[PDB]
Amino acid sequence: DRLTVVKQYVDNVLNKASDTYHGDKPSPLLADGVDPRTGQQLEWIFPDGRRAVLSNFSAQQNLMRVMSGLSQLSGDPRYQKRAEDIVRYHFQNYQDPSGLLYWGGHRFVDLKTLQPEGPSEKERVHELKNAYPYYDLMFSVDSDATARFIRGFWNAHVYDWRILETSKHGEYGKPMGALWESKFEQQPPFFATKGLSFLNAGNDLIYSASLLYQHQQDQGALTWAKRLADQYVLPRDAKTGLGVYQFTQALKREEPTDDADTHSKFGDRAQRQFGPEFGPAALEGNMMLKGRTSTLYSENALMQLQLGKDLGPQGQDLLKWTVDGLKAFAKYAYNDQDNTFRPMIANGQDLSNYTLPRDGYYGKKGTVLKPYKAGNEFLISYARAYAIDNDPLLWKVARGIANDQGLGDIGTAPGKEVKVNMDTTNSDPYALFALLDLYHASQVADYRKLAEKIGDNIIKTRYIDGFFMASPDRQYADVDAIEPYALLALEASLRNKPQAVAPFLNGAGFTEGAYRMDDGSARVSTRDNELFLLNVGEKLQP
């Protein structure tokens, strides 16, 4: 029984991931990772060998949504209460005077000492990339502290409000500037700036300001949310409609001397590595490569489709921008013969099977850029876009992904010649989410019946030792796993209470810094993502 499984799972998290380091006076905070076999919590190793237990609240915002949803569907308020208590504790102890939290890519809390940590000593800064925190919960606990965070986030990460120069990181302890009252002057596409306007952090700026508007009716927040979203639309290629991952280019401060030194101070990294053969259109924002296209055509799309709907009449432009881009990506990059996307430049250039002729930001010389399989995160974004605009081009991508993923044939159109694979072994929570989206818009029973099968596969093959794991051999389970989130969304659908579970935007957290190896050496740019990929007996490789 799915709801019973999720309740048992969250009970297990609150037992095994809890603060066991302060006797009978524990904090409410949780460890990000737990070995489900032993209960060992995942640790970060600092240069002197001190071990901290990783508690990064930005990497727990799927769990927070799971706990809220579990309380809604079960009627047991203890999970909502604990999620609220964790939020309250972070505002009480881990929010600096500027409003920023000790979370994100380069800050976390040590569950043993309850001190904020900074694992990247050259980077003791605030960083959110495709995080999408559960601000709805935070506002219900403390609306002023949540608003202070969102304003402080923009205050630290907007380097120049006149031109909307943004940055993926921000400093703590900054005084508040003019914020939404700042004067703005729109600049031409790909103006040169120091700050890096990557859309993974831009996603979090747009989303947070939109939630501040939703909760506090802050019209300045909404104006700048829409303006920042527009910054990623204005530079899109005039002919293809593709792009963009960023809307500025790196300000060239020094002449480069080595291809393999990719510091942004030497200028746009794509223009260095691709400029000689491809010309001026080779800019970082225009590189439609694996990963970048997930941030653009999945994470940004999920958030903007939901925001566009929420805004009603004044969200129509946002919906058009978002769907137009997904159409362009399908038209140029999708290969329906083998369910791949072509690596591309946004001017329409195909980079399939291109061999890199020099070292650079996008790979060593000799690297071959290959078409890459379209994963289930794109099944979600194409399903949701089709619900808004019933375009057969969008359906073709959804149908190709589902077929490639072993789900069968979702039909030539919703409900037309459906032949789904009810014996599928697929256990991907992303596929479950996408099938619920196809079902919600079409009301075709077979899509939810297939979603039930995926849910049963998730329980059968990923519910292991009381936790959810991507493989039975993984060393650590992630308490932010989205398997239980998909299961709750399925239960909410079956119970005719879809609003019981927060909309899935595919956010996640990460932690990055130097990590100490057993020989005492420093492994720079280590990520907790890497720790969660280890199997039993495996260690991080240099």
Ligand X SMILES: O=C(O)[C@H]1O[C@H](O[C@@H]2[C@H](O)[C@@H](O)[C@@H](O[C@@H]3[C@H](O)[C@@H](O)[C@@H](O[C@@H]4[C@H](O)[C@@H](O)[C@@H](O[C@@H]5[C@H](O)[C@@H](O)[C@H](O)O[C@@H]5C(=O)O)O[C@@H]4C(=O)O)O[C@@H]3C(=O)O)O[C@@H]2C(=O)O)[C@H](O)[C@@H](O)[C@H]1O
Instruction: Please count the other Cβ atoms lying within 10 Å of the Cβ belonging to residue 493.
Output: 19
Instruction: Give min distance, CB of 251 to ligand X, in A.
Output: 9
Three-state secondary structure of 242-277: CCCCCCEEECCCCCCCCCCCCCHHHCCHHHHHHHHH
- Applying CB under 6 A, the span of 135-143, 256-264, 329-337, 382-390 interacting with ligand X comes to 256-264
d(CA 234, CA 249): 14
Q: Which two tokens stand for residue 432?
A: 């479950």
- Applying CB under 6 A, the span of 86-94, 175-183, 262-270, 309-317 interacting with ligand X comes to 262-270
Considering beta carbons, is residue 146 or 298 the nearer one to ligand X? 298
Instruction: Give min distance, CB of 512 to ligand X, in A.
Output: 7
d(CA 20, CA 35): 15
- Applying CB under 6 A, the span of 257-265, 302-310, 311-319, 348-356 interacting with ligand X comes to 257-265
- Applying CB under 6 A, the span of 56-64, 152-160, 259-267, 316-324 interacting with ligand X comes to 259-267
Q: Is 168 in the site for ligand X (CB under 6 A)?
A: yes
Kindly state the number of chain residues that form the binding site for ligand X, as judged by CB under 6 A: 10
Are residues 434 and 387 in contact, defined by beta-carbon separation less than 8 angstroms? no
Helix boundaries (H) for 48-162: 61-74, 78-93, 135-141, 143-157
Q: What share of the chain is helix, strand, coil (3-state, %, to 5)?
A: 45, 15, 40
Instruction: Give min distance, CB of 406 to ligand X, in A.
Output: 26
Instruction: Give min distance, CB of 165 to ligand X, in A.
Output: 12
d(CA 473, CA 114): 31
Instruction: Give min distance, CB of 530 to ligand X, in A.
Output: 11
φ/ψ of 311, rounded to 5, equals: -85, -10
DSSP 8-class letter at 369: E
Site for ligand X in 277-316 (CB under 6 A): 291
Site for ligand X in 353-412 (CB under 6 A): none
Q: Is 263 in the site for ligand X (CB under 6 A)?
A: yes
- Figure out which of the listed residues 2, 90, 129, 215 binds ligand X, where binding follows CB under 6 A: 129
Name the β-bridge partners of 18.
30
Site for ligand X in 192-211 (CB under 6 A): 194, 198, 200
Instruction: Give min distance, CB of 424 to ligand X, in A.
Output: 28
Q: Is 272 in the site for ligand X (CB under 6 A)?
A: no
Considering beta carbons, is residue 131 or 137 the nearer one to ligand X? 131
Considering beta carbons, is residue 288 or 492 the nearer one to ligand X? 288
Strand, coil or helix: what is 197? coil
- Figure out which of the listed residues 27, 40, 214, 264 binds ligand X, where binding follows CB under 6 A: 264
Q: Is 82 in the site for ligand X (CB under 6 A)?
A: no
- Applying CB under 6 A, the span of 43-51, 261-269, 299-307, 531-539 interacting with ligand X comes to 261-269
Are residues 35 and 477 in contact, defined by beta-carbon separation less than 8 angstroms? yes
Q: Is 213 in the site for ligand X (CB under 6 A)?
A: no
Q: Which amino acid is at 333?
A: A
CB proximity list for 21: less than 8 A, separation 6 or greater: 53, 111, 112, 113
Site for ligand X in 93-122 (CB under 6 A): 122
Considering beta carbons, is residue 200 or 442 the nearer one to ligand X? 200
Q: Which two tokens stand for residue 331?
A: 């038209």
Instruction: Give min distance, CB of 204 to ligand X, in A.
Output: 12
- Inter-CA distances, 540 with 103, 106, 109, 448, 511, Å: 23, 19, 22, 40, 15
Instruction: Give min distance, CB of 340 to ligand X, in A.
Output: 18
DSSP 8-class letter at 126: B
d(CA 491, CA 12): 20
Q: Is 485 in the site for ligand X (CB under 6 A)?
A: no
Q: Is 60 in the site for ligand X (CB under 6 A)?
A: no
Are residues 192 and 248 in contact, defined by beta-carbon separation less than 8 angstroms? yes
d(CA 387, CA 378): 14
Instruction: Give min distance, CB of 330 to ligand X, in A.
Output: 22
Instruction: Give min distance, CB of 225 to ligand X, in A.
Output: 20
Tell me the pairing of strands 419-420 and 408-409: antiparallel
Considering beta carbons, is residue 443 or 525 the nearer one to ligand X? 525
Rounded CA Rg of the chain: 23
Considering beta carbons, is residue 20 or 264 the nearer one to ligand X? 264
d(CA 185, CA 366): 43
Instruction: Give min distance, CB of 228 to ligand X, in A.
Output: 16
Considering beta carbons, is residue 122 or 460 the nearer one to ligand X? 122
CB proximity list for 269: less than 8 A, separation 6 or greater: 250, 262, 284, 360, 361, 362
d(CA 357, CA 369): 12
Instruction: Give min distance, CB of 194 to ligand X, in A.
Output: 5
Instruction: Give min distance, CB of 94 to ligand X, in A.
Output: 22
Place of tokens 């291809």: 259
> Could you list the residues that contact ligand X (CB under 6 A)?
122, 129, 168, 194, 198, 200, 262-264, 291
